[PDB]
Amino acid sequence: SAVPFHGAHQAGIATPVQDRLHFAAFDVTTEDRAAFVALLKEWTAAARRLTAGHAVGEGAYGGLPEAPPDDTGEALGLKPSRLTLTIGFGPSLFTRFGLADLRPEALADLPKFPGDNLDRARSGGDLCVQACADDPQVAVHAIRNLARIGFGKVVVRWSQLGFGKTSSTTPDEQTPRNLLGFKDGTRNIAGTEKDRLDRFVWAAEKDGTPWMTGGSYLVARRIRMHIETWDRASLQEQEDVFGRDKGEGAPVGKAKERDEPFLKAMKPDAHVRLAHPDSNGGATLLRRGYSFTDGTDDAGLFFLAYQRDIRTGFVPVQRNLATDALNEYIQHVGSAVFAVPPGVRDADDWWGSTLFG
Amino acid sequence: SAVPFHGAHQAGIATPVQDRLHFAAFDVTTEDRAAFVALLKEWTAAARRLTAGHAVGEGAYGGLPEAPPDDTGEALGLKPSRLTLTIGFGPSLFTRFGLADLRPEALADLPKFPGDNLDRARSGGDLCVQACADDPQVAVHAIRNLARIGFGKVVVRWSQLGFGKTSSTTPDEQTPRNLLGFKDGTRNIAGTEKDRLDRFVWAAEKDGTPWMTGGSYLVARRIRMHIETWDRASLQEQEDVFGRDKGEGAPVGKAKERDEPFLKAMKPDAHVRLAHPDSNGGATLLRRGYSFTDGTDDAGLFFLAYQRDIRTGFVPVQRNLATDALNEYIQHVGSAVFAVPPGVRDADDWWGSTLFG
Numbered sequence: 001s002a003v004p005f006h007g008a009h010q011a012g013i014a015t016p017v018q019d020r021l022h023f024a025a026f027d028v029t030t031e032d033r034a035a036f037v038a039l040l041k042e043w044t045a046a047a048r049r050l051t052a053g054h055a056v057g058e059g060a061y062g063g064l065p066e067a068p069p070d071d072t073g074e075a076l077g078l079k080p081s082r083l084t085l086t087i088g089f090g091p092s093l094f095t096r097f098g099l100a101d102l103r104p105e106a107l108a109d110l111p112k113f114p115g116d117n118l119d120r121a122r123s124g125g126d127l128c129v130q131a132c133a134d135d136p137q138v139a140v141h142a143i144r145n146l147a148r149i150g151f152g153k154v155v156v157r158w159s160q161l162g163f164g165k166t167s168s169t170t171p172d173e174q175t176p177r178n179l180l181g182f183k184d185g186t187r188n189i190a191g192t193e194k195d196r197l198d199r200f201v202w203a204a205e206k207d208g209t210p211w212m213t214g215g216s217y218l219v220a221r222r223i224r225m226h227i228e229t230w231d232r233a234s235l236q237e238q239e240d241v242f243g244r245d246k247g248e249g250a251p252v253g254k255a256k257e258r259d260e261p262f263l264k265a266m267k268p269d270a271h272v273r274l275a276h277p278d279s280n281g282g283a284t285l286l287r288r289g290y291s292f293t294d295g296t297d298d299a300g301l302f303f304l305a306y307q308r309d310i311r312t313g314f315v316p317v318q319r320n321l322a323t324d325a326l327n328e329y330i331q332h333v334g335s336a337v338f339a340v341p342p343g344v345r346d347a348d349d350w351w352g353s354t355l356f357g
Numbered sequence: 358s359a360v361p362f363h364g365a366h367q368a369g370i371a372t373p374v375q376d377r378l379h380f381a382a383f384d385v386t387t388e389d390r391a392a393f394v395a396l397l398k399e400w401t402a403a404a405r406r407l408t409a410g411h412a413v414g415e416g417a418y419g420g421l422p423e424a425p426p427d428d429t430g431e432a433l434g435l436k437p438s439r440l441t442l443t444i445g446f447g448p449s450l451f452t453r454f455g456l457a458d459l460r461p462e463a464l465a466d467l468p469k470f471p472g473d474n475l476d477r478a479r480s481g482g483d484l485c486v487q488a489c490a491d492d493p494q495v496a497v498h499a500i501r502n503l504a505r506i507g508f509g510k511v512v513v514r515w516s517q518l519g520f521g522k523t524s525s526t527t528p529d530e531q532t533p534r535n536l537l538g539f540k541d542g543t544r545n546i547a548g549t550e551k552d553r554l555d556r557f558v559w560a561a562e563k564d565g566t567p568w569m570t571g572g573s574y575l576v577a578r579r580i581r582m583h584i585e586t587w588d589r590a591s592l593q594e595q596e597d598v599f600g601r602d603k604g605e606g607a608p609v610g611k612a613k614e615r616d617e618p619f620l621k622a623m624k625p626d627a628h629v630r631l632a633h634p635d636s637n638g639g640a641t642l643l644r645r646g647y648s649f650t651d652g653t654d655d656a657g658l659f660f661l662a663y664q665r666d667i668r669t670g671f672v673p674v675q676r677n678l679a680t681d682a683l684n685e686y687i688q689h690v691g692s693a694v695f696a697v698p699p700g701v702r703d704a705d706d707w708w709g710s711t712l713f714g
């Protein structure tokens with residue numbers, strides 16, 4: 001039930017995609033670099049307990065009566081639930097703590113895209129923590145407790161619950177469905193495809209930023225779906241939009257979900273035809289997003305993409321989506337990029353240790 | 358994996374509490390009574406399929422290419438997941454369709470309570486559907502599809518995802534924890550306590566409103582928790598607030614969660630001491646709430662209470678909570694009441710049939 005926390009890479013990327021998400025972007029509120037480093041170490045200690053299904057610190061109760069408990073207690077009695085906790089550093093972090101010269105070139109600000117309506121209050125962030133688990137209360141508890149530990153040093157800028165995955169790093173397993181009712185994750189990158197991960201996802205030292213070796217770069221997009229209009233489109237219109245049929249999820253002219261697509265059989269504005277690596281000079285992403293619902297005017301896809309360089313991953317693919325037929329039914333309304341550092345190597349290592357030293 | 362949809366009562370009340378919730382309040386946008394009745398019948402048909410784990414209508418695909426699919430498809434491949442769908446009618450519904458004289462006296466508007474800060478846009482509603490399931494995507498899919506079918510006749514006014522239950526109708530089973538880290542649901546009403554249900558939850562014909570016989574009355578409160586301040590309170594302060602210890606959940610002076618409380622051993626402003634039936638002339642509720650998180654300024658408890666009469670259930674208990682020590686750490690920010698009709702008796706019956714005729 002538990003995913004190993006330590007490794008050369010952070011878990012929660014190549015890892016099998018868990019059912020639920022709680023994602024939080026944080027802003028830094030302290031200018032004390034030593035104190036922020038202390039926080040990262042204590043966060044890392046908490047993450048080891050959390051991902052093993054243990055309460056933070058000395059637990060949720062049984063401590064001194066006059067002291068606040070170490071763990072807030074809402075995960076008591078639940079399982080590890082394949083919890084992973086993945087940290088990332090936004091561009092804005094590098095204006096602090098004398099970090100300016102360490103900002104990676106691969107951590108490029110995104111260009112404006114046609115159709116954007118980005119809510120600034122739900123965009124950006126000095127850092128992020130991605131909490132993925134099969135039990136949403138386990139994920140929320142992890143974020144909440146990290147936020148508690150960080151009180152006075154960081155604040156939650158924005159946060160997003162994903163009630164169900166729309167992604168896959170395990171192609172042999174059942175591909176999940178997004179809120180448009182289509183299988184989502186058929187052609188991605190598998191946790192077992194080490195060469196493809198090395199090529200498309202993990203930063204290498206020779207790329208230009210040594211502290212980011214073994215790390216990756218994350219693009220988050222909050223994408224609202226126009227559900228009411230989509231639901232009144234014909235089945236054929238829906239299928240034409242993607243280039244795959246709805247039930248089986250097979251490409252046009254093929255019999256099975258996993259049959260390779262023949263792209264020119266799709267509409268010239270079909271999503272898959274436009275997003276496929278062949279249409280983008282070989283550019284390839286590890287998508288790891290989740291569906292959301294957030295009351296009313298309000299639901300969609302909290303899109304997440306990992307790549308070795310934002311400039312050669314998300315940016316050219318999204319640009320090619322300018323004529324996507326899907327555009328009629330979606331709108332990007334939030335955005336953030338993060339440099340996701342390499343893994344916590346052992347019990348003495350700590351999140352951000354390669355960046356801070 | 359499936360809960361029976363038909364019965365003398367609607368499921369989703371006395372039923373074992375499922376892990377997740379999607380709750381939606383709807384406003385009626387049509388003045389055509391016959392068309393609204395037609396909608397209720399089609400909603401009921403959908404509910405039978407949904408609760409059995411089947412797609413609505415003729416399914417999510419395989420229909421005529423030029424027609425919108427009958428089911429939006431996002432629950433394909435998932436299980437019934439103990440889905441229940443419970444409908445209720447708000448006070449405002451009775452201003453329509455010539456229903457004025459049928460509004461139950463037990464459907465009383467709530468008085469103002471000290472500390473209220475009710476968001477009107479997230480309060481009220483002509484009707485509600487409570488979708489409870491162990492899989493949140495199953496619940497969301499049910500609500501979404503009901504909303505789709507109702508297009509042009511109803512609109513979603515507000516909706517609320519509950520990521521984890523904070524209630525219990527099964528006392529022998531593990532009591533879940535709320536976001537304050539306490540067990541929540543220890544002393545409630547069990548699905549097997551038929552006499553207590555008859556006394557405290559189900560409306561009887563002699564109560565004054567014949568069409569509501571076998572129905573119940575629902576109070577919804579969206580209650581924000583002041584997490585940041587709570588998390589800096591001592592363990593003892595937290596325990597004093599409730600009158601039970603945090604780990605075991607035992608009343609003051611007792612050894613086990615389910616030991617009966619001795620109320621006068623608790624602080625005079627302790628939550629349990631103030632809410633207990635003995636302190637309220639015997640008034641007793643069936644609580645069935647869920648935790649929520651909704652980004653930032655934002656988390657708490659989406660409180661749900663069922664009772665035979667709002668005036669003898671929620672109202673006097675909440676009034677007695679005026680001096681609750683818990684008040685320092687919570688605020689009611691949304692509210693609605695609904696008359697929840699009796700059950701769908703058989704395959705030919707329909708939601709609201711006793712009210713509309």
Ligand code: HEM
Pocket residue numbers: 178180182183184185186187188221223225242244261271272275276277285300301303314317318321330
């Ligand atoms: C709400 C928005 C979106 C929805 C509903 C959606 C849905 C889908 C679906 C159903 C597929 C086909 C199944 C699969 O192979 O995964 C797909 C494929 C894909 N999408 Fe999206 N997508 C969305 C946004 C995006 C965005 C913003 C990007 C990148 C900027 C993107 C990049 C891709 C890529 C690279 C593939 C695989 C194409 C291939 O190699 O065959 N998608 N998407």
Ligand code: HEM
Pocket residue numbers: 535537539540541542543544545578580582599601618628629632633634642657658660671674675678687
């Ligand atoms: C965020 C708000 C609230 C929280 C965190 C909370 C939490 C709790 C907890 C931990 C218990 C003890 C365990 C149990 O027996 O269930 C309890 C009991 C109870 N609560 Fe609340 N509660 C809240 C709001 C309310 C409200 C608004 C009402 C009614 C107006 C209410 C009525 C009751 C009742 C009737 C009991 C059982 C008392 C007994 O018979 O022993 N609660 N609550």
Ligand SMILES: [Ca+2]
Pocket residue numbers: 240267325
């Ligand atoms: Ca077209």
Ligand SMILES: [Ca+2]
Pocket residue numbers: 597624682
């Ligand atoms: Ca006191």
